Amino acid sequence: MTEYKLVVVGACGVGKSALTIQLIQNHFVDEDSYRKQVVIDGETSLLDILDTAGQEEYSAMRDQYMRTGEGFLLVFAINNTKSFEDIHHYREQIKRVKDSEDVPMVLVGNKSDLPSRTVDTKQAQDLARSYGIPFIETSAKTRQGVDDAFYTLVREIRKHK
Amino acid sequence: MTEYKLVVVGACGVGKSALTIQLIQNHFVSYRKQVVIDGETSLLDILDTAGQEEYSAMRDQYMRTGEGFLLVFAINNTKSFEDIHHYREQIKRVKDSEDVPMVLVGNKSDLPSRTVDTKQAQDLARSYGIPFIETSAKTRQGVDDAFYTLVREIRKHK
Amino acid sequence: TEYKLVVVGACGVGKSALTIQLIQNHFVSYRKQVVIDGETSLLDILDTAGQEEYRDQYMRTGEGFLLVFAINNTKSFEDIHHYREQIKRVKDSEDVPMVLVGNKSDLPSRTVDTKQAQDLARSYGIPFIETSAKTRQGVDDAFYTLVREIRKHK
Numbered sequence A: 001m002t003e004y005k006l007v008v009v010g011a012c013g014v015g016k017s018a019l020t021i022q023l024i025q026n027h028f029v030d031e032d033s034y035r036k037q038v039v040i041d042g043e044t045s046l047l048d049i050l051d052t053a054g055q056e057e058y059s060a061m062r063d064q065y066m067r068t069g070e071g072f073l074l075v076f077a078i079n080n081t082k083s084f085e086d087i088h089h090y091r092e093q094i095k096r097v098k099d100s101e102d103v104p105m106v107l108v109g110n111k112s113d114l115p116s117r118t119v120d121t122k123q124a125q126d127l128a129r130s131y132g133i134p135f136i137e138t139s140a141k142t143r144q145g146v147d148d149a150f151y152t153l154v155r156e157i158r159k160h161k
Numbered sequence B: 001m002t003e004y005k006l007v008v009v010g011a012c013g014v015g016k017s018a019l020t021i022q023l024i025q026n027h028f029v030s031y032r033k034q035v036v037i038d039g040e041t042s043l044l045d046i047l048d049t050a051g052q053e054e055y056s057a058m059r060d061q062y063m064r065t066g067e068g069f070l071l072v073f074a075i076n077n078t079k080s081f082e083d084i085h086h087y088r089e090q091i092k093r094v095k096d097s098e099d100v101p102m103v104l105v106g107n108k109s110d111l112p113s114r115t116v117d118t119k120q121a122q123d124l125a126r127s128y129g130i131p132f133i134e135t136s137a138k139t140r141q142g143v144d145d146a147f148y149t150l151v152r153e154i155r156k157h158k
Numbered sequence C: 001t002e003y004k005l006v007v008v009g010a011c012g013v014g015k016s017a018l019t020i021q022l023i024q025n026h027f028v029s030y031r032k033q034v035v036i037d038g039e040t041s042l043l044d045i046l047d048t049a050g051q052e053e054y055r056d057q058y059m060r061t062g063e064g065f066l067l068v069f070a071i072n073n074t075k076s077f078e079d080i081h082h083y084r085e086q087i088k089r090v091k092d093s094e095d096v097p098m099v100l101v102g103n104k105s106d107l108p109s110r111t112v113d114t115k116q117a118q119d120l121a122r123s124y125g126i127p128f129i130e131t132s133a134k135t136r137q138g139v140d141d142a143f144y145t146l147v148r149e150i151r152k153h154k
């Protein structure tokens, strides 16, 4: 059976854990590792997921997951300009550790349910276009885009393989 | 607000009209509907192709006009599933693009006489890189999901 | 039970094509026995095509009116106001059964949008039905809806 090691990266507080909880546990209320078998396009897939902002205690485990991670969600929040500005850093770090220019990634703009917006959808779309990766708008609260984000990433991994 | 022109294609008798009627009128025996998808209100305009679709020239016109396509087969009609590749190839040819919003739809899911397995259809959709939704115009299973997913694919393309 | 229906609208909007599609069921004063709302009805349909504008008896006698414009003919839509006002004046009533009909819906382009027509029909307090005499889309709906409006009035 196929396993996918996924890493969810982005600034503290953008909703990485919330997105992963919604995917895996199917709830939201207002732990950084998860493991579950799902079915994606008829293929049974074990997802092994790590959420990380890059500043957590277990750096050794983080470096391991970065090296073996097959795909990455690059997450910012639409009401957090700094988190959007941080995306380039995260992508550059992944490319360095993987020593590759072809790493499966999806850009995720979370908290789309909130009326406070400081990052334009066009900004994000433009950035994702430059990187050659999909952009998905999500809300961990309403479930908007959550399956799409993770499943699109799994589809990017298959493309790569 | 944003209007999306949608075209439902597939073999005669797979339930394209039935799917449309179930979407718009919530009935199983009007082509426009306002919907909210992912927080955005949109107008679905399903092109009415009845009568005219028998002519290739008109089919070409509808394909050029449409922004996204449901590729419908019936799960108790193997030939209708086999016909899907041809229909997709015509859309790609006419719109001169290898990237056109489409969703694969396996209709009549309520029937026991299934001859097209979920796996066969999933494999096809995975190859095309498009969503696959199983539907029944009779029970309403999957009907909103099929059309709303197509809108999502159109939005991604644009 | 007889219903006297009158089809009005600018030249070339499809008044005759709609009438013939209803009666004879093909695309190019009339009577047709129909069943509507379970009731057997005799429809007397006056196609005013070619009728000279200079028909007081037909209007006063007419029980319901199809106000037809073509969705690719802005002027024909503008002309609907004329017909509406003329009929209300001549019949001397504010409650005359009418249906607004936007014909030629099969054409690939349109210059009168659905919202425009829906809003005008709302102003008038009448139904709006999009039709194609060519494909028969909406044709029965238009005439049957008018019969229903007459019944509500009666």
Ligand SMILES: Nc1nc2c(ncn2[C@@H]2O[C@H](COP(=O)(O)OP(=O)(O)O)[C@@H](O)[C@H]2O)c(=O)[nH]1
Binding pocket: A010, A011, A012, A013, A014, A015, A016, A017, A018, A019, A029, A030, A051, A110, A111, A112, A113, A114, A138, A139, A140, A141, A142
């Ligand atoms: N309204 C809203 N709040 C969210 C969303 N995602 C996360 N949150 C909230 O944002 C805060 C931080 O989320 P968290 O998952 O801990 O962020 P992380 O540090 O990236 O793992 C929490 O209070 C969450 O409930 C969302 O999509 N919408």
Ligand SMILES: Nc1nc2c(ncn2[C@@H]2O[C@H](COP(=O)(O)OP(=O)(O)O)[C@@H](O)[C@H]2O)c(=O)[nH]1
Binding pocket: B010, B011, B012, B013, B014, B015, B016, B017, B018, B019, B029, B107, B108, B109, B110, B111, B135, B136, B137, B138, B139
């Ligand atoms: N049992 C079942 N019958 C269906 C379904 N959808 C359509 N039908 C029937 O299939 C036949 C053809 O449907 P229709 O909408 O006319 O097909 P079209 O030619 O693709 O537009 C009709 O007898 C419908 O009642 C479905 O989901 N379940």
Ligand SMILES: Nc1nc2c(ncn2[C@@H]2O[C@H](COP(=O)(O)OP(=O)(O)O)[C@@H](O)[C@H]2O)c(=O)[nH]1
Binding pocket: C009, C010, C011, C012, C013, C014, C015, C016, C017, C018, C028, C049, C103, C104, C105, C106, C107, C131, C132, C133, C134, C135
């Ligand atoms: N494409 C299309 N042409 C129509 C339709 N209805 C009428 N026509 C054409 O428009 C022209 C005028 O139709 P006609 O019935 O004579 O209009 P009238 O003057 O209002 O009675 C003719 O060439 C018809 O064939 C329709 O629904 N679609």
Ligand SMILES: *CCS(=O)(=O)NC1CCN(C(=O)CNc2cc(Cl)c(Cl)cc2O)CC1
Binding pocket: B007, B008, B009, B010, B011, B012, B013, B016, B049, B051, B053, B054, B058, B059, B060, B062, B063, B087
């Ligand atoms: C149901 C018999 S029919 O001859 O009237 N319609 C056929 C025509 C051939 N065909 C398709 O090409 C696939 N469906 C389809 C494609 C397009 Cl582009 C359009 Cl506009 C409409 C339809 O139905 C099957 C149905």
